[PDB]
Amino acid sequence: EVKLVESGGGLVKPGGSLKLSCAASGFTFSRFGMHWVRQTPEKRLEWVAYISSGSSTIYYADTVKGRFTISRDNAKNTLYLQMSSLRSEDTAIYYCARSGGIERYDGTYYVMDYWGQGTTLTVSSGSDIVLTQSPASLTVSLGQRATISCRASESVDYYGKSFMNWYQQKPGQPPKLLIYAASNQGSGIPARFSGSGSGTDFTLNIHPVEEEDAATYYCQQSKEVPWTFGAGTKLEIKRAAAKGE
């Protein structure tokens, strides 16, 4: 089984610098591209940086360009993120995620599949594709239907395939992939989760809901750099009245 362990976070002063590390195990690290993604105290997910297996292709988010540097050491199975000129907007939990390919009859589809537990950073005193997700929260009775919607600012279709993915996150855990390519079931993901849509409009349906489905749900597009996420929907489960004879 694949495992990623991040380290190096802490509380730091504005203007300073820091280096984060991630130790990988359970897979051949040198064959895979890798990402860093952060999550703010308000629970917004923001992609930060990507590095290819041979350190030859590298991408950064606009808000971190010039201040952050991603690197890797394939012999020691470790990924790094160095940060300088730190400011308030950088306070977040930082996660490392693997870029894993799902082989299919029409191509290999790359998605953020396994994520680590994260490491926390706190800074002390002193034409992207936008995804519009709704509702902000909802409460559903056991066995009934949850429905969540996404509108993208431009099409996420690329010759008949839609690059829309859905994630589930429970408190204390990283996000988990549920649905890829708009409507394809992840491995081992139960049939009660289903996704649909195309072009700019997408939906996630959960039915019949179960007690363990209380969580926050996020859409994400992987058609163009930067990878972007919707704002998140918090689902709660309502107790139903007991039935008599």
CATH number of the CATH domain containing 109: 2.60.40.10
Q: Identify the bridge partners of residue 70 per DSSP, sorted by sequence position.
A: 81
With CA atoms as reference, report the closest residue to 121 among 39, 48, 227, 50.
39
Supply the range of the domain harboring residue 105: 3-123
This entry's atomic model was obtained through: X-ray
Query: Breaks in the chain follow which residues, C to N over 2.5 Å?
Result: 126
- Is 145 contained in some domain? yes
Distance in Å from the first CA to the final CA of the chain: 47
Contact 81, 36 (CB under 8 A): yes
Whether residue 147 is found in the same domain as residue 68: no
* Residue that is last in its domain, among 99, 123, 147: 123
d(CA 179, CA 167): 7
Q: What does DSSP say about strands 146-152 and 201-206: parallel, antiparallel, or unpaired? A: antiparallel
Q: List CB contacts of 35: < 8 A, sequence separation 6 or more.
A: 47, 48, 49, 50, 96, 97, 98, 99, 112, 227
Closest to 231 (Cα-Cα) out of 162, 131, 163:
131
Q: Are 81 and 20 in contact (CB under 8 A)?
A: yes
Tell how far CA 129 is from the center of its chain: 16
Q: Is residue 243 part of a domain?
A: no
In a domain, 244, yes or no: no
Q: Which residues of 153-174 are buried (b: 16+ CB within 10 A; e: fewer)?
A: eeebbeeebbbbbbbbbeeeeb
Asked whether residue 110 is assigned to any structural domain, the reply reads yes
Distance CA 100, CA 32 (A): 7
Residues 7 and 101 in one domain: yes
Nearest to 87 by CA among 17, 7, 166: 17
Domain boundary among 94, 123, 152: 123
| 3-state SS, one letter per residue, for 94-156 | EEEEEEEEEEECCEEEEEEEEECCCEEEEECCCCCCCEEEECCEEEEECCCCEEEEEEECCCC
Q: Are residues 62 and 152 in the same domain?
A: no
